[PDB]
Amino acid sequence: SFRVALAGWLYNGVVTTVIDDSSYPKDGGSVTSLENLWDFFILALALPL
């Protein structure tokens, strides 16, 4: 996935690379759950690429 994201920078107008739906926190999420917070942290560092 990392190398595919790197290769997708050359074809902006043809193909769009987005984060998969499953990666986002489940059913909304709450700051209440540790598992959820980590999902958010993982998503936050991978979104900018």
Partner: protein, 49 residues
């Protein structure tokens, strides 16, 4: 008995619970079929009169 006895799961967040419980209910076209049936009923009564 219902008034005097009632409890929630040990942990609970209403947002996540309802976002999980309501989603399966919103995949159906029964209400739309009902609207079509209502239109047919009104057309039929006007035609009859």
């Amino acid at each position: 008995v219902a008034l005097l006895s009632g409890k929630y799961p040990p942990d609970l967040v209403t947002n996540v619970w309802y976002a999980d419980a309501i989603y399966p209910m919103y995949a159906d076209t029964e209400v739309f079929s009902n609207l079509q049936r209502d239109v047919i009923t009104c057309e039929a009564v006007q035609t009859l009169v």
